[PDB]
């Protein structure tokens, strides 16, 4: 009774927004997957149809994040992300659009799966769309601090950069979850769909701070679990809500978040960031082979498989609804064509 | 009235159509427009999308219990097609034409492949070019039959009556977005290769008396087999919808100078028009069909064949997953 849809929208009715992708993304049932399981109805919400550069979450990201680069007048745009990253390829489209020069520095966290890793899925996108790579960095390194360094000497050159950090992941960057959750709301409500659960892959942890601002904004109920692509689950929840409060600050909410809403599950992770699982293989065949839908092995895939799972020990009752959230990926599909043919 | 034949939903309609303005501004002539043909959301989309609405319908219908299809091996349809039918729970029999042999092992196994691949796709057999594929499939499909199944054969591209019925609607959706957005379009271009996209069109903007030009840029074939080829399969279109009247055979035209050296094989040309999109948009293309459409719109605009205030629609029929495909090419630059 108590939910407020739109006061969300409110505080972000303040903030710039640039139309760079093709919203609302549909949401959608999964019935093949729902059978096979033989668990609750699982819902899909499709933010790999976002429209840029073949589309992903990082888009709802860059929205806000190059609207507020355009109000500093910013003339370059430097990002930095793993070799196979979905957020460098997305920034490079995104400013190309508006007209904009990306530098990136790519870290080399993955060194397997041979040259196609190297040289095709993003990487050989983010050469298309022209990106400026500037230096391949070692696992490891300082990235943001390694990004001010160079912000530092293009500004002595005369330019005006703007700096996106990894994955987007700043508090304006977290605004375009916080209008995802809105647009989440209104959707099901029009739909007359009842949520009992949002699932989603969590990595830099942009994506996951947004919606948890963007529920509790607007007093509603949708408990939200963050599959951890990396970090462990301790170490995840707290940068989830450390990020999701300085989110809460900027769209001037006053009070606080409750802590309780920051969940994450980090037993879908595997050895590492960029190393797909058995599990993460067998979720990326099912949600193909099920339903036509592509998932990728570092991120969707990783947040799908945590969700089988989950389901396959009954974490969840038939009557319930779960919502997935595909946060896209589908090009570094390509980076991983060594490992898929074993 | 579409509605009196069945169709399922595939994809994400209508798509958008959105003004490019560095492009526009870049050529210095008309102001161009991009339907998003390429955002359909079916296993990275594309036009092949459109078809199957009502192919997977019709073939639903009939009680088909297989799919069979056939394309080049780094075919959009063959890929699109397993996605659709894996959403109905049917599996997918494909048999591969190599067209094209150049491109090392990234054609071979990259792109579309790979997709095919994960998708679950049966791939029968890889024909040598030349092949008669549609004579190869009705083997397949009697064989099948053999077997007790229930075969639906879909035909290259997609691009049966049924078929084009996908692009009919797009013409519609056209309409009705230019007339709410109070655009005037004055051309539209699209890469032509199947046929089955400018059937549709053709049909669809002539049933409502649009007097919008289309334009088919061919990917393969020359310019008078392309036209013959499609007015046919817009003439059957036509009668399959009931539309009074016939189709004028003049609202066929097809330009077919940049095929280049044929099917699959791009030009200097196809290569700057996906660095152009690419650099000044952020949209990405393909070096067989779209990069090639609009390569010639490229072109055409630098001969002064329109002039500034001129409206152009560019269908952006996909193919973005065939990049991969390409990679060996794109590391000689």
Same mark, same amino acid.
């Given at each position: ?190 739909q007359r769909l009842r949520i009992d659960h949002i699932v989603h892959a969590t990595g830099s942890t942009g994506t996951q701070a947004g919606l948890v601002t963007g529920? !509790? ?6 408990? *939200? $679990? &963050? @599959?951890?692509?990396?970090? +462990? ?5 707290? /940068?989830?809500? !450390? ?6 600050? *900027? $769209? &001037? @909410?006053?009070?606080?978040? +409750? ?5 994450? /599950? ?77």
């Open positions: 009774g108590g939910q407020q849809m739109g006061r969300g929208s409110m505080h972000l009715a303040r903030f710039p927004r640039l139309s760079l992708g093709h919203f609302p993304t549909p949401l959608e049932v999964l019935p093949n997957l729902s059978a096979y399981l033989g668990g609750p109805t699982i819902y899909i919400k499709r933010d790999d149809a976002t429209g840029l550069a073949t589309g992903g979450n990082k888009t709802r990201k860059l929205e806000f994040l190059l609207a507020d680069a355009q109000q500093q007048g910013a003339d370059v745009i430097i990002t930095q992300g793993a070799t196979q990253s979905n957020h460098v390829r997305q920034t490079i489209a995104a400013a190309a659009k508006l007209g904009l020069k990306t530098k990136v520095l790519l870290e080399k966290r993955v060194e397997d799966y041979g040259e196609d890793y190297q040289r095709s899925g993003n990487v050989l996108l983010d050469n298309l769309l022209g990106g400026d790579i500037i230096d391949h960095l070692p696992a490891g390194t300082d990235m943001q601090q390694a990004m001010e360094t160079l912000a530092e000497s293009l500004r002595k050159e005369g330019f005006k950069p703007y700096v996106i950090p990894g994955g987007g992941s700043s508090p304006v960057g977290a605004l375009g979850y916080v209008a995802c959750a809105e647009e989440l709301l209104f959707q099901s409500s029009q529920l !509790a904004a607007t007093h509603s109920q949708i408990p *939200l $679990l &963050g @599959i951890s692509v990396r970090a +462990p689950k301790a170490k995840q929840e707290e /940068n989830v809500y !450390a990020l999701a409060q300085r989110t809460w600050q *900027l $769209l &001037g @909410i006053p009070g606080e978040l +409750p802590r309780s809403a920051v969940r994450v /599950n980090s037993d879908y992770v595997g050895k590492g960031y960029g190393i797909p699982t058995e599990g993460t293989l067998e979720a990326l065949r099912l949600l193909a082979q099920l339903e036509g839908i592509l998932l990728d092995p570092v991120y969707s895939g990783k947040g799908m498989a945590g969700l089988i799972d989950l389901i396959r020990q009954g974490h969840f009752r038939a009557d319930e609804n779960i919502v997935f959230i595909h946060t896209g990926g589908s090009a570094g599909l390509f980076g991983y064509r060594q490992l898929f043919e074993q």
